[PDB]
Each structure stands twice: as C-alpha cells, then as structure tokens.
Structure 1
Amino acid sequence: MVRGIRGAITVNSDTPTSIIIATILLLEKMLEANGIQSYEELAAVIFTVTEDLTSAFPAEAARQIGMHRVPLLSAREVPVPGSLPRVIRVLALWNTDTPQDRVRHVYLSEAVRLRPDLESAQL
C-alpha cells in the first residue's frame, strides 16, 4: 500500500546552491503538505533534473536534511523542445493508506505551469 507524491520547482541559474536550496524547499514542502512526520514513512525518493541543470546532485541536498535513511535516485527528464526549463521534479514514494485524491502535490516557483489542469482535453 503506497502512494506517489509529485513535486516540481524551477531555478534561475545552474549553480550548486540554487539547486540545493530549491530541492530542500520543495522536499520539505511536500512532506509538510501531506503531514509526513518522519522519513521512515518514505520507501524511496526519486528526482529528475532537465538537461540544463548539472552542477550538483539533488541527493547531496537531500542528505543535508537527514535523508541518509531514505533511498535516493536521480536522472534527466526528457529534453522536450519548448518545455519549462531548469525544472527539478520529485516523485517520493510513501507507505500510506491515504486516498489518491487526498495526496497534496506540490508545484512551486515557475513550475506551477506544470500543475495538472483538472479539465485539460480529456479525450
């Protein structure tokens, strides 16, 4: 019994600091929004940077908030033309019985454009 939590955030320059600050901000907001008390509830956490963010790891930021307990992994989300640039996306996996429609997703900064519209196309 697991739920997924999507996250997203943008930076304004590809520097180690701005990546780490944006990662911690998004991570800590995602936990607070869902009421995550401890890291023991997380099974694992996954990150995606774009092609243009390279100078530092999302893991290095996640380790400076005590998530050595948490399994981490990162890669590069598809380099799609015209997509929102310099965006870090998070999928944290959460051992919980919470309903799917309850989980708070956290889209921050300029990445709120990626917030799923409730009625978009729906073919």
Structure 2
Amino acid sequence: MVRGIRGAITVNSDTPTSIIIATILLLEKMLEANGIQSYEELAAVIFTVTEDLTSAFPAEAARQIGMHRVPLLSAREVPVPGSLPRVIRVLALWNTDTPQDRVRHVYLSEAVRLRPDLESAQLEH
C-alpha cells in the first residue's frame, strides 16, 4: 500500500549550493505537508533534474539531512523545448493508507506553474 508524492522546485543558477538548498527545501516541505515524522515511512525517493542542472546530485542533499537509509535515485528529465528551465522534480514513494485525494503535493518557487489544474483540457473520445 504505497502512495507517490510529487514535488518540484526551481533554482536560478547551476551551482552545487543552490541545488542542495533547493532540494532540502523541497524535501522538507514535502514531508511536513503530509505529516511524515520518520524517514522510515519512505520506500524510496526519485529525483529528476533538467538538462541545465549538472553540478551536484540531489541525493547528496538528501544525505545532508540524514536520509542515508532512504534509497535514492536521480535521472535526467526530458529536454522539452520551451519547458520550464532548471527544475528539480521529486517522486517519493510513501508507505501509507492515505487516500489519493488527500496526499498533498508541493510546487515551490517558479515550479508553481507545473501544479496541475483540475479543470483543464480533457477529451470527448
């Protein structure tokens, strides 16, 4: 019984210090928004960074707040032209019986645009 939790945040330059700070900010606001007390509830955490962020692994930031026992994995996001630049995305798999409608997802800094609209698009088909 697992629920994914999405996060997303942006930085203004490709430096290790700004990637670590942003990731820690995003991670901590994600845990607080759902009331996670212990990292033991996380089954794994997955990060994606855009093509223009290469100076540090997000996993390095995770271990700075003591997530050593949490399985971490990072990858490159699809380089879509005109998409929002310099964005760290997070997918945390969470062991919980929380209903999907009740899981809070976090979009910070410029990434508030990536927040999904409940009344958008959709098809007749």
TM over 0.5: yes
Q: 2: CA distance between counterparts of 1:13 and 1:86?
A: 8
1:52-109 deviation line (CA, Å, top 9, x unaligned): 0000010000000000010000001100000000000000000000000000000000
| Unmatched tracts of structure 2, length 5 or more | none
Q: 2: CA distance between counterparts of 1:59 and 1:69?
A: 12
Displacement of 1:122 in angstroms is 1.4
Structure 1 residue runs of 4+, over 6 Å off? none
1:22-49 deviation line (CA, Å, top 9, x unaligned): 0000000000000000000000000000
1:6-37 deviation line (CA, Å, top 9, x unaligned): 00000000000000000000000000000000
TM-score, normalised via structure 1 length: 0.99
TM-score, normalised via structure 2 length: 0.98
Q: 2: CA distance between counterparts of 1:122 and 1:38?
A: 38
Q: 2: CA distance between counterparts of 1:34 and 1:24?
A: 16
**1:4 match: secondary structure:** strand
Give the fraction of aligned pairs with identical amino acids, expressed as a percent: 100
Q: 1: CA distance between counterparts of 2:115 and 2:103?
A: 14
Q: 1: CA distance between counterparts of 2:20 and 2:78?
A: 21
Matches within 5 A, 1:45-84: 45-84=45-84
